[PDB]
Write a protein that binds this ligand. Structure first.
Ligand SMILES: Cc1cc2nc3c(=O)[nH]c(=O)nc-3n(C[C@H](O)[C@H](O)[C@H](O)COP(=O)(O)OP(=O)(O)OC[C@H]3O[C@@H](n4cnc5c(N)ncnc54)[C@H](O)[C@@H]3O)c2cc1C
Ligand SMILES: Cc1cc2nc3c(=O)[nH]c(=O)nc-3n(C[C@H](O)[C@H](O)[C@H](O)COP(=O)(O)OP(=O)(O)OC[C@H]3O[C@@H](n4cnc5c(N)ncnc54)[C@H](O)[C@@H]3O)c2cc1C
Ligand SMILES: OC1CN(C(c2ccccc2)c2ccccc2)C1
Ligand SMILES: OC1CN(C(c2ccccc2)c2ccccc2)C1
Lengths: 586, 588
């Protein structure tokens, strides 16, 4: 038991020191390692639940039981032995002795891979991270940091914010400011400049941060040819093979395209939208996911003429009453919808004018589910899902098992069917596809491999926010999911409309914002899911995700007092139930 | 045991029907009561844990143990047949109105807690009256039903706070690509006051209509407890009379103090006046350092005023002082001036307020610093924010026996009972309780439930979250750092902290390291979160949800294992790691 942990820890750690805080002979070793620039993990025996057993158990490797004791599985010595290697100039060569080039190779430099790399490096692991950005069909490309940094959460929430500031210009007049919203316009390329300027500063920050943790950054495409061999390819095409003890796969996903004529040739995806040199103009967004809705939302707030093509429903997998309230708000505020509709081909009427910086022109043809026809836009953005391309990363012969969708099947500690290879982030099968999830898995995984830790990532009840023009925050089950799992008779739902105080003087709507709490009667009225639609929904929801992790019930919400003038306080006084039939309005 | 609960409930309730859900004889009696428009509390016995024992105890009053049993003001009325005999004989309505006094409940004070108590008492059939009156300010300002928050507190102040934030929203819009020129935009104070006052007026009317449609008598009259059941009311027409009630709830709030210096009451104003002021204040001196004074000073600067705050000693006494100082440093860097360690001596009139052209006067303010050097500057407006106090002398005849602490607040047990057994107190006049509007609503709604419905839930007053609405907002829940260190000793306290920068501030070119958060934790108790603090945008919305986890005893581990929501400020709480003992820098 304790036997198996210690044998595991001593085998994968690069440089580890077993120690005590009060021990003086250990501080002498720490000081030598500190002085010689030797990074290492450290286990202070005197603060562990079974430090006595561990100390006795260490003798099985070192034939001693005292407490200043390891490099890559090999016992090195006590303080006397280590000082002697130090004095005689032998110490640096033993700590670099390795069967492989790196203790860890990370394939993919995004939210999870950068986070796993930086954490391993802190415990002495010799570490390389690989990153390469295959261009889009028109050639768009970007720098280190992954999908969120460059073409995901960071540029889309900045663009969300450009769009919110438009209603702030509307609201300012009613609070007494002299401006006239009706004679202000928005300049797209000015906005893209500021957004890209911030993205480039993150590109630079990550490069600076790997340099300062002594992580090798290879800007190269990687391929696992064998359990410890990674084939890399240069920007000059030069092919080479590096070796690593532990491999972490963290290569993420890219957007899909429908198999129709003109899709790849004349349409774009979100990959291209966030650095586009011209304003998209009259835009058709094809899709109904959060990417499609979020992008269609801010393009509308920035003045554009915007249509969304919906195959079946909005936001599949999320609570469908909230999805529809989200949709009704957008449809009431500009965004147009072609419902139960699908595209059949894109034809080109004008080519993109690179000179004068202008979009092209396109004819879009399709049909509705009843057969009726759909038939002009300047930009077509496809947002019809995302997928990994592991055939380009992972030679079949290696042995890494995949599920039917192309994602990696992993144990609950991120390990693949090949004992030294792990996977994190979007390509980990059945996990929430979110940046904060990728970062926590990567950091905890790196501590287990090189520092003796045991903590797992908890993937249950992870909160979300959809940054549509009115935001929608969620934590836990949807309403339909709770009923499907426990029966309607066992589910109680408390809900209420509300109106932000900032909307009163601005003459905004009375009962569009909405929140609800999905509970379980038989389990002391346990909160199964939380849903809020309104401004700052992400800030509202986060704090509640902690109490749900702790098993919060309706009583825990009742007995907590609200903070006044806020929207979030409405959760602390909810009382109208859906079965009561009472109206939720204010 | 259970028996003395049942007698407190039966003796106190107005109309109460002991029933069972499945019982068909009960459902017949419910509908008779619903038809004749007779409201009542209902205690379903098959949905309480030990209702079988209670059935036995009901015999102590009614000599039966059958299910349908109705009581009116402590008297057993009848079972199913007897209440149907009363109905068809034109007798039910006389028995249900049989009362020793005019009302079951008199609420003195129609503010946050009083209106809430009255509304919930009327639900369960209590004949309720709620008195409200607004003594005018020295310059004669006056307002309508609702209390201090609705008319001259949390509601107009956050709206003016909001007008102030839109200034920086207008600045940021240029950087996000909008064409406006912030330079050429100014503010109009009177246009703003009209909108805020319009929304207030709509709230005055909503409360009158809520009270009408709950069957609560609203008397616009000043009330005075003369005996334990007798309240004396004075009209707007100066007319005096005497009503009586079984239970009395005192909920009369507070008003702003003035310092005893020449000129103050004559030529100064307070918060009661600032939110309906017909003219813009102009160059303004705010005296004091509480959340009222900083919040008001903050939006006047944001609106474009020339503003000075006179601090006697420290900012935000009683709060976390590292946080208080970060608040004050932000303000000083964005145009609020402070006169530090300074106190006023007199206010001299130089010019009278021009009511006709709608312009302020001119004042001279003279005071002195602790170093002996003198203060002398002219100000168009001077606002005192130097505390708030109750005036129970005007409410409470000394002969009644309601005991008060040295400050003038009402001593109460943990269910709000005064030293006179039928009189309670809620809100700002309850001694030792957080003086906050949500607290006064929960106190009010829970007390009414206990008196007229047989509920037992108490108000929990510990760890009540707050938010100070300065230009950069400050949210807090729990103990401040110096309080935890004092209570447990410094070696038992660990503090995790971090600077942050909202994503919205990146393209807007705002500062990198002003926003800040910290968790104050107790080592020897599983790293228990003793207090949470955040300085930043939307601090109210950030803090609220964590108040639930803290009520539940959250630890640092519980914050670690919860995952963030990305693009948010609030997610920085889920990955804190730098400790103060460590001495590592918290910057970004
Ligand atoms: C438009 C959009 C908006 C989003 N908004 C949010 C949001 O608000 N909040 C949120 O939590 N999540 C959001 N997400 C999801 C978030 O981007 C992902 O969950 C996150 O990026 C997953 O991180 P990862 O490390 O698994 O993958 P990635 O960040 O994509 O990292 C993979 C990296 O590896 C590179 N790579 C691929 N193949 C190879 C190879 N063979 N060799 C070397 N390098 C390779 C890729 O080019 C890339 O740089 C959004 C996603 C999109 C598309
Ligand atoms: C400027 C300011 C800003 C504030 N901002 C906030 C904030 O953001 N959040 C927050 O939670 N709290 C805030 N507060 C505090 C909040 O206003 C109070 O905690 C709350 O109003 C207390 O409610 P109450 O029912 O105890 O008293 P009140 O609201 O004052 O109600 C008492 C009422 O009774 C009336 N009355 C008095 N004497 C008599 C009498 N003899 N007969 C009849 N009627 C009488 C009074 O005129 C008044 O209408 C603020 C306070 C101020 C001054
Ligand atoms: O024809 C049906 C209308 N449906 C969507 C819809 C509703 C409102 C606005 C836009 C779109 C929808 C369906 C289901 C969940 C949420 C929204 C497609
Ligand atoms: O912004 C400045 C810092 N603020 C004061 C302060 C605020 C909180 C705690 C202590 C001190 C102050 C400083 C020095 C002398 C007197 C008061 C106002």
């Amino acid at each position: 038991g304790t036997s198996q942990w210690l044998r595991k820890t001593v085998d994968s750690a690069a440089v580890i020191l077993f120690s005590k805080t009060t021990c003086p002979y250990c501080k002498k070793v720490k000081d030598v390692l500190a002085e010689a620039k030797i990074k290492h993990a450290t286990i202070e025996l005197d603060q562990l639940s079974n430090g006595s057993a561990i100390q006795k158990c260490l003798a099985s490797f070192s034939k001693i039981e005292t407490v200043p004791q390891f490099v890559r599985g090999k016992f090195i010595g006590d303080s006397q032995t280590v000082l002697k290697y130090y004095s005689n100039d032998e110490l640096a060569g033993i700590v670099n002795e390795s069967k492989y080039d790196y203790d860890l190779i990370v394939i993919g430099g995004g939210s999870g891979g950068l986070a796993a790399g930086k954490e391993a490096a802190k415990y002495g692991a010799k570490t390389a991270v690989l990153d390469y950005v295959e261009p889009t069909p028109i050639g768009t490309t970007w720098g280190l940091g992954g999908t969120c940094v460059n073409v995901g959460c960071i540029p889309k929430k900045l663009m969300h914010q450009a769009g919110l500031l438009s209603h702030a210009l509307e609201d300012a007049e009613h609070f007494g400011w002299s401006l006239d919203r009706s004679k202000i316009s928005h300049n797209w390329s000015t906005m893209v400049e500021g957004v890209q300027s911030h993205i480039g500063s993150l590109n630079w920050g990550y490069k600076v941060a790997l340099r300062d943790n002594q992580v090798t950054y290879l800007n190269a495409k990687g391929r696992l040819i064998s359990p410890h061999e990674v084939q890399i390819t240069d920007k000059n095409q030069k092919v080479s093979t590096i070796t690593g003890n532990k491999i972490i796969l963290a290569t993420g996903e890219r957007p899909k395209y429908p198999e129709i004529p003109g899709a790849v040739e004349y349409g774009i995806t979100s990959d291209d939208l966030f650095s586009l040199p011209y304003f998209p103009g009259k835009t058709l967004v094809i899709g109904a996911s959060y990417v499609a809705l979020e992008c269609a939302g801010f393009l509308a707030s920035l003045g554009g003429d915007v249509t969304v093509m919906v195959r079946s429903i909005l936001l599949r997998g999320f609570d469908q009453q909230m999805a529809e309230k989200v949709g009704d708000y957008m449809e009431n505020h500009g965004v147009k919808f072609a419902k139960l509709c699908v595209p059949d081909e894109i034809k080109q009427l004008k080519v993109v004018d690179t000179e004068n910086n202008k979009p092209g022109l396109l004819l879009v043809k399709g049909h509705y589910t009843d057969g009726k026809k759909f038939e002009e836009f300047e930009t077509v953005i496809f947002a019809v899902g995302r997928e990994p391309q592991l055939s380009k990363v992972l030679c079949e012969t290696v042995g890494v098992k995949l599920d039917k969708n192309g994602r990696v099947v992993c144990t609950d500690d991120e390990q693949t069917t090949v004992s030294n290879v792990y996977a994190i982030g979007d390509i980990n099968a059945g996990k929430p596809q979110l940046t904060p999830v990728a970062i926590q898995a990567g950091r905890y995984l790196a501590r287990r491999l090189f520092a003796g830790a045991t903590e797992l990532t908890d993937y249950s009840n992870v909160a979300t926010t959809v940054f549509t023009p009115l935001e929608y925050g969620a934590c836990g089950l949807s309403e339909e999911d709770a009923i499907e799992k426990y029966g309607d008779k066992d589910i109680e739902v408390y809900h209420s409309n509300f109106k932000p105080l900032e909307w009163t003087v601005a003459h905004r709507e009375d009962n569009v914002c909405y929140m609800k709490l999905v509970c379980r009667k038989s389990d002391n009225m346990r909160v199964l899911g939380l849903h809020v639609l309104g401004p700052n929904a992400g800030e509202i929801t986060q704090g509640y995700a902690v109490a749900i992790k702790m098993g919060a019930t309706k009583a825990d919400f009742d007995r907590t007092i609200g903070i006044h003038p806020t929207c979030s306080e409405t959760f602390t006084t909810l009382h109208v139930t859906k079965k009561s039939g009472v109206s939720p309005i204010v």
